[PDB]
């Protein structure tokens, strides 16, 4: 539970996780480091990609790479919509398995996704590339 953030200077803040790591947020439109809102977008991408690769490895599917293209829109400033586009690379991965993994990840397993869903329109999509 012990996370903290500290004002460094300007609008730069230091962020310390309870897993013992530190990061930097920059409130000048992410000038020198990501803005908090960028943190959120990336965390959604990351949490999702984690679960997607996990499901495939458990299902013995030979997943070799995973990339997430994130797009979003926001009020002129809350996010109105985030799209997670998965690019899954592997050997014999079947469509049904990738759909399952992207599905369960985005709507059942990804905490970040599920928290945002109650306030943001979150959509997903995927493609499969041979290695």
Per-residue x/- marks for its own copies, 81-110, CB under 8 A? ------------------------------
Reference 124, options 84, 67, 82; nearest CA is 84
Residues 50-79 that bind its own copies (CB under 8 A): 50, 53-54, 65-74, 77-79
Q: Which of 93, 97, 116, 126 binds its own copies (CB under 8 A)?
A: 116
**Tally of CA atoms within 13 A in the half-sphere of 44 that contains its CB:** 27
Nearest-CA neighbor of 66 among 16, 113, 127? 127
Q: Interface with its own copies by CB under 8 A: which range of 91-99, 100-108, 116-124? A: 116-124
d(CA 49, CA 52): 5
Interaction of residue 41 with its own copies, rule CB under 8 A: yes
Rounded to a whole number of angstroms, the CA Rg of the chain reads 17
Q: 28 Cβ partners below 8 Å, 6+ apart?
A: 10, 11
Interface residue with its own copies among 13, 103, 104, 128 (CB under 8 A) is: 13
The residues of the shown chain that bind its own copies, judged by CB under 8 A, are 1-7, 11, 13, 15-19, 21, 23, 25-27, 29-47, 49-50, 53-54, 65-74, 77-79, 111-112, 114-120
């Amino acid at each position: 539970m012990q996370a903290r953030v500290k004002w460094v200077e300007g609008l730069t803040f230091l962020g310390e996780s309870a897993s013992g790591h530190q990061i930097l947020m920059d409130g000048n439109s992410g000038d020198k480091a990501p803005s908090p809102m960028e943190m959120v977008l990336m965390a959604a991408g990351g949490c999702s990609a984690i679960d997607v690769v996990s499901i495939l490895q458990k299902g013995r599917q030979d997943v070799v790479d995973c990339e997430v293209k994130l797009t979003s829109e926001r009020r002129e400033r809350l996010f109105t919509h985030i799209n997670l586009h998965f690019i899954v690379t592997g050997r014999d991965l079947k469509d049904a398995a990738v759909a399952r993994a992207v599905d369960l990840s985005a709507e059942k397993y990804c905490s970040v996704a599920l928290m945002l869903e109650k306030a943001v329109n979150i959509t997903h999509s995927y493609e499969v590339v041979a290695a």
